[PDB]
Amino acid sequence: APEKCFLQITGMTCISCVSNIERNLKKKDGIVSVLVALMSGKAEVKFYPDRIEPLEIAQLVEDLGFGASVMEGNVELIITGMTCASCVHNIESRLMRTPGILQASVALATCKAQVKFDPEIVGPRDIIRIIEGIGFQASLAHKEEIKQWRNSFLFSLLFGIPVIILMIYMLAATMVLDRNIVPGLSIINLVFFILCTFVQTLGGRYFYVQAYKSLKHKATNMDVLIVLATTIAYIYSVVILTVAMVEKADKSPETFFDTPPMLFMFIALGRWLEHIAKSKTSEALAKLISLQATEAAVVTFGANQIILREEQVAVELVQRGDIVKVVPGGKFPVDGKVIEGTSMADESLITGEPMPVRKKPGSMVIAGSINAHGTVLVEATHVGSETTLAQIVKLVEEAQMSKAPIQQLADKISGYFVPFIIIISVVTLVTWIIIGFVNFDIIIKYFPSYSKNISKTEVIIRVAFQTSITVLSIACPCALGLATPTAVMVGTGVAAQNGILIKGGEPLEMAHKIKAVMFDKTGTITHGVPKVMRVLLLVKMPLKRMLAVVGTAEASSEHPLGMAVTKYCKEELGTELLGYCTDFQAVPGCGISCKVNNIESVLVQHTVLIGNREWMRRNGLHISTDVDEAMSSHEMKGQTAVLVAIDGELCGMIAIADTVKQEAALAVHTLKSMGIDVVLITGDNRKTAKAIATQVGIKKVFAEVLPSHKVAKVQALQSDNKRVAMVGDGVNDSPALARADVGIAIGTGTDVAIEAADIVLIRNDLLDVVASIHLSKRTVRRIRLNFVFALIYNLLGIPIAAGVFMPAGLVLQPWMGSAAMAASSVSVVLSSLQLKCYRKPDSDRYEARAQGHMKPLTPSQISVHIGMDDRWR
Numbered sequence: 001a002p003e004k005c006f007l008q009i010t011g012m013t014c015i016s017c018v019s020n021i022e023r024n025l026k027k028k029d030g031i032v033s034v035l036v037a038l039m040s041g042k043a044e045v046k047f048y049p050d051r052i053e054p055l056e057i058a059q060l061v062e063d064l065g066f067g068a069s070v071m072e073g074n075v076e077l078i079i080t081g082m083t084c085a086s087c088v089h090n091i092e093s094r095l096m097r098t099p100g101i102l103q104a105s106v107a108l109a110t111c112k113a114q115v116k117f118d119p120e121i122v123g124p125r126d127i128i129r130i131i132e133g134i135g136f137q138a139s140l141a142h143k144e145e146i147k148q149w150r151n152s153f154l155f156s157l158l159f160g161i162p163v164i165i166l167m168i169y170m171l172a173a174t175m176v177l178d179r180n181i182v183p184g185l186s187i188i189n190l191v192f193f194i195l196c197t198f199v200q201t202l203g204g205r206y207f208y209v210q211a212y213k214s215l216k217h218k219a220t221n222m223d224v225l226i227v228l229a230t231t232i233a234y235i236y237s238v239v240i241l242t243v244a245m246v247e248k249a250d251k252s253p254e255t256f257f258d259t260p261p262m263l264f265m266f267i268a269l270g271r272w273l274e275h276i277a278k279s280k281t282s283e284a285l286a287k288l289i290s291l292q293a294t295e296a297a298v299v300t301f302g303a304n305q306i307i308l309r310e311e312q313v314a315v316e317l318v319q320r321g322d323i324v325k326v327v328p329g330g331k332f333p334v335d336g337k338v339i340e341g342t343s344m345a346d347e348s349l350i351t352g353e354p355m356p357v358r359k360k361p362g363s364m365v366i367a368g369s370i371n372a373h374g375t376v377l378v379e380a381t382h383v384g385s386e387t388t389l390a391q392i393v394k395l396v397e398e399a400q401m402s403k404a405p406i407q408q409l410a411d412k413i414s415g416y417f418v419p420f421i422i423i424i425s426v427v428t429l430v431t432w433i434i435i436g437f438v439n440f441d442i443i444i445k446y447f448p449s450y451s452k453n454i455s456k457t458e459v460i461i462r463v464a465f466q467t468s469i470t471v472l473s474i475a476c477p478c479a480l481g482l483a484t485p486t487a488v489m490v491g492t493g494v495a496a497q498n499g500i501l502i503k504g505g506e507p508l509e510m511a512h513k514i515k516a517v518m519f520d521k522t523g524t525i526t527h528g529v530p531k532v533m534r535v536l537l538l539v540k541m542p543l544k545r546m547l548a549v550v551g552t553a554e555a556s557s558e559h560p561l562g563m564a565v566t567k568y569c570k571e572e573l574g575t576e577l578l579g580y581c582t583d584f585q586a587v588p589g590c591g592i593s594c595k596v597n598n599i600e601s602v603l604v605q606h607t608v609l610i611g612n613r614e615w616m617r618r619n620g621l622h623i624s625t626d627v628d629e630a631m632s633s634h635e636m637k638g639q640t641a642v643l644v645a646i647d648g649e650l651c652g653m654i655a656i657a658d659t660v661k662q663e664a665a666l667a668v669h670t671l672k673s674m675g676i677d678v679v680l681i682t683g684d685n686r687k688t689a690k691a692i693a694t695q696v697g698i699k700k701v702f703a704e705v706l707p708s709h710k711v712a713k714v715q716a717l718q719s720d721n722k723r724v725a726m727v728g729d730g731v732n733d734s735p736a737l738a739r740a741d742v743g744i745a746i747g748t749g750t751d752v753a754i755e756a757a758d759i760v761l762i763r764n765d766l767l768d769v770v771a772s773i774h775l776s777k778r779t780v781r782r783i784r785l786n787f788v789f790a791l792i793y794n795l796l797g798i799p800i801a802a803g804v805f806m807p808a809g810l811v812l813q814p815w816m817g818s819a820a821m822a823a824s825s826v827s828v829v830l831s832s833l834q835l836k837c838y839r840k841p842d843s844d845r846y847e848a849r850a851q852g853h854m855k856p857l858t859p860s861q862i863s864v865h866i867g868m869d870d871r872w873r
């Protein structure tokens with residue numbers, strides 16, 4: 001009992017592996033008990049130290065074929081009625097008195113209690129029972145960004161449309177508007193000042209805080225650009241108005257109060273649209289939590305002659321060492337060993353396939369599995385976080401948190417732009433000061449400011465500052481923000497129209513970078529439902545008659561292969577109605593015997609035996625060499641096969657297997673032609689995976705891959721610097737989908753897989769994945785083009801604003817500033833909208849492009865990898 005040791009085990013891929021390890025270790029003398037988990041690869045062994053040593057245990061585990069290495073409970077409760085300190089003190093004293101409890105404290109302010117103890121000796125149930133006996137009850141314990149950007153945009157609009165309208169009205173012709181309340185100001189100037197001040201105070205607040213955050217990050221983005229430009233323009237306008245007032249100037253100076261409202265308007269709109277597009281809801285965690293069983297039926301004493309009472313207890317409160325009865329159709333509450341129970345379990349959560357798995361005494365079960373075929377009793381071994389489903393939840397959380405935001409190309413452009421605009425503005429200022437100082441005739445000729453009585457130096461300085469600030473205002477791109485959001489929304493709409501649901505804007509901008517794609521085998525590449533592939537005849541009755549007789553015999557069978565056979569027979573036959581007279585008898589996993597005396601019904605449209613080789617061997621029916629070879633070939637192909645005999649005579653054989661999707665081969669070929677790697681990762685048997693890869697022409701095959709191993713492969717491929725797209729439709733694929741750079745979920749897949757994936761194929765056609773790439777390409781290029789439209793119109797303005805074309809007679813006009821934004825925004829919006837004309841490439845185009853290049857692959861060329869370390873053949 002004492003000196004229990006901890007071990008780390010690697011190379012283990014099956015629950016049967018865990019059962020074998022536990023059985024072998026317990027068989028050896030000295031070892032008292034052994035515990036191990038599947039995905040965690042952690043084990044705990046209790047043994048007598050004086051008989052065996054941890055090194056011997058590690059050597060024994062290694063001999064089993066799994067690498068072994070030697071390496072080195074808190075409960076929170078709320079208790080009602082904790083209104084007195086005496087009760088808390090008494091509870092604490094009673095807790096310390098009981099053995100196995102290390103510490104226990106209770107807070108009177110919030111009635112919360114924390115207890116630290118050894119799980120092997122004490123559990124939450126004991127503490128709860130003690131508290132109840134004492135006399136008290138105890139029980140165990142982005143939109144903001146959108147809202148703020150929307151508020152900024154709305155304020156900027158409300159207080160910027162009026163000023164823009166006033167500017168347009170002035171541009172069209174207005175005498176009263178130029179009238180001066182005081183010698184310096186004018187009505188228009190005062191209204192502009194008030195409106196710009198209101199917009200800056202209200203609309204720009206979030207701009208200012210975001211810019212401050214960006215500077216704290218040692219980076220300059222669009223927010224910093226807008227804040228700098230608008231603040232400079234507003235400060236200069238206020239300063240010139242103030243000096244005009246002080247000097248009682250006859251004419252009010254030109255002001256740039258127009259610019260800040262305009263830029264705030266459009267940039268806030270762009271940011272708001274970007275945040276709307278980026279928003280997504282991930283509920284995979286909620287679905288996984290829903291998978292786990294809510295409660296368990298704890299059984300006191302044992303399953304042996306003494307069975308005193310049963311209780312219903314929350315799975316959270318369940319502790320190791322308690323026998324729990326799971327009824328048919330009920331979820332397995334905790335991982336454990338089956339005792340005195342035999343049934344079937346669905347392990348699609350881990351292994352991923354729908355084939356039921358037998359459970360017998362000495363076997364192991366996984367939490368969250370669906371039981372059937374009868375009741376079972378389970379002795380718990382892992383509970384709570386230690387459960388496999390909890391480990392999958394942890395992996396999904398880690399994958400989701402690992403993902404980092406992708407920097408917007410707008411921010412990257414602004415990072416260069418801000419120094420560029422600063423440099424050009426300073427250059428314009430200094431060169432104009434120099435020109436004014438050296439000659440001063442150019443200033444007289446090209447500006448009326450010389451008419452002012454101020455000194456020449458003041459004239460040149462004011463002209464240089466005005467020109468520099470005009471250049472600064474013109475340089476700012478108003479449509480920069482909208483370029484990416486508009487294209488992202490249009491691409492998402494196009495994808496939705498074409499049958500692809502894209503959550504967020506990241507997949508559209510990332511799919512083009514994909515160079516490696518991993519495909520799940522079941523569902524994703526092949527239809528999940530098993531289907532009959534080939535029927536052979538082993539005195540010479542028609543095949544259809546035998547098929548009808550089997551379907552009548554197999555009508556009541558609940559085996560998935562049974563329903564597959566029955567549906568195949570019904571499809572082959574008229575299947576107007578099944579025979580009324582039929583007697584059925586089934587032995588679990590052995591064979592089925594039926595009596596059918598309604599062959600007349602089949603003819604209008606006397607015994608049946610369905611079994612495997614073992615059934616024939618025990619019944620005494622010999623197996624011919626040719627049929628044996630055929631069955632061996634079918635087993636090599638990985639497809640299941642069963643035999644039908646009538647009146648004790650072998651009659652026929654039926655084979656059932658999954659059917660590869662029609663477009664799987666074409667999709668794989670297209671991906672390979674485009675230069676993208678294709679990998680088949682699955683949890684099924686190696687033979688079936690190899691056969692499916694041969695059919696779909698995938699060179700790299702991974703078999704018996706646990707959910708954690710899929711994430712490990714994703715991480716390795718990403719560490720190779722490649723971008724990975726994971727296509728899955730099961731729970732085991734959800735952590736890989738979350739971790740993968742791109743996650744594609746088949747429309748018919750599980751809810752968790754759909755939630756985790758960023759792209760969902762509503763049409764459940766594999767070729768859409770290729771389209772999901774092509775469309776993404778058509779998007780990204782467009783975005784780049786939009787950015788050109790966002791800058792070119794403003795950029796061409798900069799030479800004019802700086803006076804480059806002034807001697808030619810071209811000078812900046814007030815209408816040019818507004819025209820630049822109008823043209824840029826219109827061009828960006830129209831370019832983004834043009835993506836709606838995108839047409840999905842036809843499947844016929846794919847087939848023609850691969851009409852001759854496509855070729856079947858030999859089975860030998862394909863290499864199958866079993867597990868992460870590939871220890872097994």
Ligand code: ALF
Pocket residue numbers: 351352353520521522523681682683684728729730731732733
């Ligand atoms: F359907 Al799988 F791994 F084979 F998710």
Ligand SMILES: [Mg+2]
Pocket residue numbers: 352520521522523524728729730
């Ligand atoms: Mg699947």
